Structures are given as C-alpha cells and as structure tokens.
Amino acid sequence: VLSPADKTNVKAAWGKVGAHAGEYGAEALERMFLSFPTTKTYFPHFDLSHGSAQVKGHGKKVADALTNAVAHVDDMPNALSALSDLHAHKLRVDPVNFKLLSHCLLVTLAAHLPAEFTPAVHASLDKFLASVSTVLTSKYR
Amino acid sequence: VLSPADKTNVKAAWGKVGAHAGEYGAEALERMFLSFPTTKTYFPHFDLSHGSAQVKGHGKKVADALTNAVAHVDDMPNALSALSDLHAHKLRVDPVNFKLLSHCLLVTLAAHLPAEFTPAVHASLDKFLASVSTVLTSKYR
Amino acid sequence: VHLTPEEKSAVTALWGKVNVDEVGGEALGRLLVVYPWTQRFFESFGDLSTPDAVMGNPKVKAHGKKVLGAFSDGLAHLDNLKGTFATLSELHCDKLHVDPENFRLLGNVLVCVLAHHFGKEFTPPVQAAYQKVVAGVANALAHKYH
Amino acid sequence: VHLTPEEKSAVTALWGKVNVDEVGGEALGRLLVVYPWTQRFFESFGDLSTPDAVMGNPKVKAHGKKVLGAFSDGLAHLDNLKGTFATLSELHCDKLHVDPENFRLLGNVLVCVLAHHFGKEFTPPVQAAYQKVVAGVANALAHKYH
C-alpha cells in the first residue's frame, strides 16, 4: 500500500526518467534475459541479441504502461485492466517472472539515477513495482 | 479475488474439517518443519518434537484464525487486522514461508478429506490460502 | 539427490502402489485447473474450459501418462537425476519453451495427489522424502536451461 | 559455481574497485530499509526507525563491513563456495536462526548497490555474472541448514 510519501517518491523518480523511459525499459529486459535466462522461454519469437529492435520496441511498451501506472497510481486496477486481461488469458506468464523484471528495472534505474536512487526512493520504487505486479496478475485465476 | 463459488467451496470443505481444525493445524505445522526445515528458524523457542504441547497449541491457534477468516471471507482485511499487525511488526516472518505453510495445509486437507478434495475445491482452497497469506503480509512495509 | 536409505525405501514402497496412468492424468489435470496459466502449452488439446472438461480430456490424460512414466523411470536413478533428465531438459528449453517454474508447480500438485490417494499412509516423513524427490526432478529438468 | 572466464574476469575486475567497508554498510542499510522485517535480527543495534537513522547507524556500518568482508573472501574461492562457507552456514542456522531467504534479499540489494555506485560500467553482462555469484553465495550459506 503506497503511502503519500511513496507516491511522491515514485512521481519524482519516474519524472526524472522522463523521455528515456523507453531506453530504460529495453535495458531492463536485456538485463532480465541475461541474468534470468528462464525468462527467455516467453519470447521464442524474438531476436534477443544485443540491440534488437524487437526488444527495444517491447521495452518502449513496458515503459509506457509504467508511465501510465504512475499517472494513475490511485486507480491502477482500472488503468491496467486490459493488460491484466492480456497477461492472464493470453500471455499467461508465470507470476514468478514479475519479480525478476521488477528487480531488473530497479537495477536499471539505480544505474541511471545516481542521485535520485536514495534508500527511501529505492524502497518506494520496489513497493510500487510490486503493486504493479499484483495488479497485472490479479485475474490469473 | 475469491469468486462466490470459491467461497462456497471453502465453506463447505472447512465445514467438514469442523472440530479437527486444531489437530489438522498441528499436523500441517509438523509437515512444514520436516519438509521445509528452514521454517524452523522462526521457532527456536519451541519444543518441536512430535506431539509437543507447544506445536499442538500453536496448530489450534492457526486453525482458529483460519476459521475466523472463512467466517468473514467477505471482510478478511478487517477480520485478521490484529494478526496482520502481529506478523508485520513483531514476528516478521519472511513472506516466502506463507507459501510453504499453505502447501502443507493443502496436503493435510487432501490426506483427511478424500471425498471433498476435488479439483475445483483444491483450486478454491489454494486461492483462499493465498488471500489469507496476502492479508497477513499486507502491512509489512 | 541425497536421500537416506530409509527415505529411498519409503519413496519406492509407496510408488509400488501407484497407478501411473491414473495419477498422471490426475496430476496434469489438476495442474491445469489450479494454475490455469499452465494451459498456455496445451491449446492443441481441445476443451479446457471447465474443471470437468479438463479432468475428462483424453489428451490431457495421455500427456499426464507420458510425463509421469518418465517421472517413474527417474525414481530408479535417484543417484543421478541430472544425467537421466539431461536430454529432456534440453528439449523443454530449446524446443518446447516451458518455464521451469511449471515443473515446481507440478511437483507440488503431485504431492497433493499422493496425499489424496494415500490418506494417512502419506505421513509427514514420507511427504518430506517426496518433497526432496520432486524438487530434485524439477532441478534436473531445469539444469540445461540457457 | 560455474563462471565462464569472461564472467570471472568481469567479477574480479569490478571487485578490485569496491571499498568493502562503504559498499557493505550501504548494502546492509538498504536491506533493512527496503525489507524492514529483516530488522528482526538486529534489535540490539540501536535506532532503525527511519531511513536516515538506519544508514547512519554505526553498528549497521560495522556489521555491513563484516559481512561483505566474508563475502570478499568467497570471491577468492568461487570454485568451492560450499566448503568456504560451511562454518558460517552452520553458525547462521544453529546459533543465529536466520532464514536463508535473507541471503537472497541481500544478494539482490548488493546488485542494486553495485549498479548505483558504478553506473553504466555495471553492464547487463556484468550484472549477469554477479547474479550467478550472489545466488552461489546464498546457496553456499544455506547448505548446512537442518
């Protein structure tokens, strides 16, 4: 449950991401595919090589959904409704993998926001990715 | 989210459990300590030998809390509020261990309720134990 | 893995009582019912829309039998699951794309199934031994993922 | 664990630049902030009530340095993490009663801290190599639990 401080922390951090959001989403995916190779089983139809347009493109979609979640942080279930339907009924990604991408996103933000990534901000971001993860897996069963 | 059909399934199975709830609670604990020895790190102050009064006593407490949550399945947050504060602020059990006790309670029920443990009820009970686990871990951060 | 001889003899003894085909069908179908996202690999199989449809689907029963027969044959090589399952690991990664978390989910449903089938004979110590076996199998099947 | 020589050299190079005392205090502090239930083990340590109190707590810094020091020593025996950490494994089980899930959390926080500290130098491949190492170390420390 996101406290007002957590919300402030997340809007601030994601704010400084701004326009690089897409580039950071791709890097987070690349980090995930190299560190946790089991995650590649959901992308047999992609070229996962370094610099792949497919990964970059997917990264930009992931990032834009997170941008949408930050804008609607008081009403995430409705904002992300179609994406929870999508993952629940079509993609059917095992819920364990959400934690793996969330860690990779945190790593990416850490690597790019040397000053904003304070202990308190780290805590709020991890809570926020967990809440996104919970919504996206809400309709699985 | 527990569907109404899930709630009917949990009520019916736990109804059968009836008066054995505490004996079943202790057996699930003993299953957990033997199958997943890391969980014993939270009970260094207990005699964990088979049939100890401390384990039987704790089994009954676990079972009454579950009985309280089945009674108030539509309002579990309010119903377990005291227990979520206790686990979040005092006991501080890592969330991963809720999955292990849930598995062992499901195993115990399966072993004792041959007629009622159908696929659909198994599904409903797993989902119920996941929701209890989520409410008990709610206030951790 | 590492089972004590007492543990090994307990696994072996109960398994001698198992109808591999029936338990196979039951465990695969309950996998698909309790954790419906596992249905993702199986849409070639027809009607999976309700519990009854899943449990009664002959393709599901056939797959279950094939998965559990390999499992059974692995119980004879508890000393070397990784070698026993190395080619199946490769296959499930490179060609079938199965996230190895499904092996763990299956192993926990298998345990519930044995418990339901054997009731009080499935004691805490026997459960513990089977937990080790099912985690060992899952590990062995995941070992060649890359 | 098994590292390719280019993962081994990635891990070795970065680690020669790490101030163990400073990174250790940061990693431990962040664990206690981001996952506050881990404070369960440290109530002898003082004031842990706000992020600034945890990060500036001197007992957190001191212990942080002790833990990453032992962690350092294991990078020197990457081929036999189990034998290097057997004694400490037994201590954290029998005397300290620490759930080994905490080893995993600190591994991931340490990766966060390395990324924060080294920026773009902590590339995806370097991360991958460090993830194998911290998983290895966690595993090594959990090996003697019973």
Ligand code: HEM
């Ligand atoms: C923060 C969590 C995540 C977010 C916000 C997210 C968001 C999205 C979005 C926006 C799409 C595109 C939907 C469309 O086509 O309209 C998508 C597709 C997809 N996602 Fe997720 N997702 C997340 C986690 C994951 C994880 C953890 C996995 C697997 C490890 C995964 C696997 C996929 C796959 C396989 C697709 C389809 C890709 C394609 O075929 O183009 N997702 N995701």
Ligand code: HEM
């Ligand atoms: C289904 C989820 C669980 C339920 C419903 C539950 C319920 C309870 C209840 C009713 C108490 C007694 C509180 C009182 O005295 O007022 C308690 C205490 C405790 N629980 Fe939880 N519990 C659950 C999961 C866990 C897990 C997973 C662990 C650790 C592996 C755990 C460890 C403890 C410990 C250490 C105590 C203190 C016992 C003592 O000092 O006597 N609990 N729990």
Ligand code: HEM
């Ligand atoms: C005890 C665990 C497992 C064992 C021993 C096992 C074993 C096998 C075997 C022996 C085959 C046939 C290989 C061949 O064609 O040569 C197979 C195929 C397959 N398995 Fe696994 N499996 C296991 C778990 C799983 C799980 C959990 C799933 C997914 C939910 C899965 C999905 C598949 C798929 C989709 C195929 C292809 C079936 C076909 O093409 O008809 N397996 N497995």
Ligand code: HEM
């Ligand atoms: C990277 C993995 C870790 C290593 C290498 C490590 C190593 C050590 C060492 C060197 C000591 C001193 C033992 C002695 O004086 O004989 C120690 C103590 C201790 N560690 Fe661990 N540790 C690790 C992770 C953890 C984690 C994550 C926790 C819990 C969150 C933890 C909790 C403790 C506690 C409670 C002590 C006792 C401190 C005191 O005496 O008050 N350690 N550890």
